[model samples]
Target: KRYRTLLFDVDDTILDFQAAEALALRLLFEDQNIPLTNDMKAQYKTINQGLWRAFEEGKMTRDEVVNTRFSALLKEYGYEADGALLEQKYRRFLEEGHQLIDGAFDLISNLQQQFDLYIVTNGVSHTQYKRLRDSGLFPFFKDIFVSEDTGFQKPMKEYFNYVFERIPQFSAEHTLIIGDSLTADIKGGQLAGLDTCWMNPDMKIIPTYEIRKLEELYHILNI
Candidate 1:
């Protein structure tokens, strides 16, 4: 009742992106006969998260985020690869992962019937759409805003401006943006003048509301 419009972030909020990305990365490396060790996974995640943070902070571009990741990981193994080619290969496999986060489908299916729902994600349009469709989440959203297609990424006021302009009778007071990333989703929504719900529990970089699970939105939204 309080929040009439809900902007959901796809990656970890609705979809089990942690599992999906893990499966994709594991497959990408093992397919080439390079076993991805635990240490490598840690290192890879560190570098990847750093780059993504940089991207969210507007210190790096999408090209740098993807193009540098594989090269940085391979270098640690004393191996070299074509980052572009590796990303192409990785992305193909990534498209096959449609894993869902716990309680996501049930919550979204019901919420869409009551409130105006939209997707606000910072990802490639093709993969995000494909994964959402495969996960059966695409049908629940009235519209999806992807940074790759929007000309601006999240945490930037411009990206949310683009999103706000497209929704019907949109107003910040009745809108809430949900996502797992504080820098991208929460901060972006806050800067855009809408309330934010952090999908992951956190003490630092506090959100307007924080929930550990998807069903908690019921109480937050007064369902």
Candidate 2:
């Protein structure tokens, strides 16, 4: 038993966030009576990504990330919608999306019996909780840590410290963090003195430990 505890990322790693995001964005725009154009999607992506990056870097709060991104997008289109209201509506739609990534369900199910599994995510708490519960992945996790509820986002040592302190019998030598984001998940795990596994579905970059698919974790962990 090399690792006893596993911290998993929710978006992209286990959940098909891209698919959920697309549907949520489409529904959000439709509700606002705005055309969901490619240009608008690209613009929103840029704005949203920038905000989230700022959040991980500790330059912005989760509230700012959710509230400002939509305002910035609407401003570019000469609209005057309330940012908070838009965010609320978008999150409502996002919660309804619980699409699982390929092999996510089976992989986690197999690992659940052998190791203590937990969710570590930088997302809205209510939205993440709802999605996880609706997706049937809630019961498998021993616990969940979300930045919105924890008051610290990933790539920050404080965030990992908060999680580590809450986990019973936690040990750096027997723990691993697995996720799709290099900047957030990998960096955070490194700062916390834990091994990190990058879930690189696209084979984008070389990492200390990399898996192209969720099922590959079995071989990597020798389970």
Candidate models: Cα lDDT each: 0.89, 0.90
Going through the candidates in order, what is the number of backbone clashes in each? Answer: 0, 0
Candidate 1 deviant stretches above 4 angstroms: 201-204
| Model 2 lDDT per residue over 1-223, tens place | 4899999999999999999999999999989998878999999999998999998988888888999888899899999879999999998898899999998889888999999999999987888889888888999999999887677889789889999999999998999899999999987898778889998889773345888888888988898
**Candidate 1, residues 144-203: lDDT per residue as tens digits?**
898987778998999999999899999899999999988898877887898899987433
What TM-score would every model get versus the actual structure? Answer: 0.96, 0.96
**216 Cα displacement, candidate 2 (Å):** 0.7
Task: Please state the error at residue 62 of candidate 1 in Å.
Answer: 0.8
**Candidate 2 — which pairs collide?**
none
Worst 10 residues of 1 by lDDT: 199-208
